[PDB]
Amino acid sequence: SVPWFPKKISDLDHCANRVLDADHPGFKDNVYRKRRKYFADLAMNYKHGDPIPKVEFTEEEIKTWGTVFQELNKLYPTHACREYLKNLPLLSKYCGYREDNIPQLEDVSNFLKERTGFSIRPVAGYLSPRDFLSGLAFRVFHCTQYVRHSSDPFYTPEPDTCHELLGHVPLLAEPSFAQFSQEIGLASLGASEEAVQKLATCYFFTVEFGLCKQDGQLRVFGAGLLSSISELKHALSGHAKVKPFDPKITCKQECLITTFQDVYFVSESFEDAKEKMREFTKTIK
Ligand SMILES: O=c1[nH]c(=O)n(C2CC2)c2nc(Cc3nc4ccccc4[nH]3)n(Cc3ccccc3)c12
Numbered sequence: 001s002v003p004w005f006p007k008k009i010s011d012l013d014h015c016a017n018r019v020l021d022a023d024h025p026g027f028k029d030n031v032y033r034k035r036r037k038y039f040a041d042l043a044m045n046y047k048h049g050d051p052i053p054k055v056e057f058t059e060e061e062i063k064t065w066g067t068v069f070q071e072l073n074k075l076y077p078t079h080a081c082r083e084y085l086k087n088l089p090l091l092s093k094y095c096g097y098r099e100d101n102i103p104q105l106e107d108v109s110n111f112l113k114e115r116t117g118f119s120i121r122p123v124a125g126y127l128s129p130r131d132f133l134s135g136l137a138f139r140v141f142h143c144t145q146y147v148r149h150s151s152d153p154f155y156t157p158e159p160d161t162c163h164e165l166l167g168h169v170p171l172l173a174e175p176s177f178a179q180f181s182q183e184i185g186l187a188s189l190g191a192s193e194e195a196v197q198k199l200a201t202c203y204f205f206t207v208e209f210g211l212c213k214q215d216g217q218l219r220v221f222g223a224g225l226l227s228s229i230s231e232l233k234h235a236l237s238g239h240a241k242v243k244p245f246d247p248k249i250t251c252k253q254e255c256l257i258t259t260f261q262d263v264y265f266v267s268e269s270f271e272d273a274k275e276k277m278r279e280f281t282k283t284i285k
């Protein structure tokens with residue numbers, strides 16, 4: 001029968017806590033060790049209704065952010081979709097997006113709440129697909145608060161806060177994107193294991209690695225691209241395989257992690273991607 005799923009936004013307290021390795025940069029770092037523990041604990045003890053704890057980031061952490069931030073910002077005008085470019089300066093103004101400042105999740109959450117009703121919840125680590133997607137049903141983005149190791153600013157084995165803030169947040173501020181995202185979460189609620197994996201894959205090739213066509217040009221809206229200097233350039237380089245976004249086809253595609261994607265999917269628009277998902281979710285309900 002139907003598995004447990006959240007019925008209200010505070011119900012995410014019951015799944016968001018259901019979560020390093022030696023190959024990771026920073027395994028070797030005792031200070032980074034304690035820091036990550038500190039971030040994980042903040043997420044574990046967060047309960048819905050709490051202000052998200054404000055963090056004093058270290059100078060090393062801010063420098064790492066600045067390095068990623070600076071290089072990525074050179075590429076956004078020519079690579080990011082128009083919605084991304086529209087919202088990014090608003091975040092600069094209202095949430096302190098600067099090369100020399102890491103935005104606080106609480107500010108970003110308040111900004112999004114007034115823009116689309118989206119909000120942030122710090123998450124200690126990787127959640128099951130089901131739990132992660134369930135947050136979106138209440139317009140809750142489960143969001144990492146830690147920073148990648150300073151040794152390698154340009155690669156992270158995992159979503160860190162830099163990826164969340166530069167990759168995800170600007171589009172969550174966009175009504176059409178937020179509707180699309182929430183509908184993925186809503187479709188997942190209490191769905192079968194198979195449906196959840198299918199929805200997770202569609203989410204992956206849209207929210208995380210999606211491309212869209214705007215005024216005849218391919219642009220990027222996927223968060224994983226927008227926080228990855230290499231793959232951002234590669235995705236629009238012309239040497240990449242591209243297919244039309246089509247849920248029944250896209251949900252079969254394998255989600256690669258330790259490498260560039262084999263293929264990227266192109267949505268006509270967020271509205272259209274939304275309409276296709278709606279048609280698709282009917283066949284998996
Ligand atoms: O917890 C998740 N569970 C899941 O099942 N999915 C998949 C989509 C259903 C997730 N996805 C993302 C965010 C995310 N952003 C990424 C960017 C590039 C590669 C992987 C990414 N995962 N997270 C958050 C997260 C937080 C800490 C460590 C790993 C992942 C999850």
Ligand SMILES: [Fe+3]
Nearest residue numbers: 159208223224
């Ligand atoms: Fe992500």
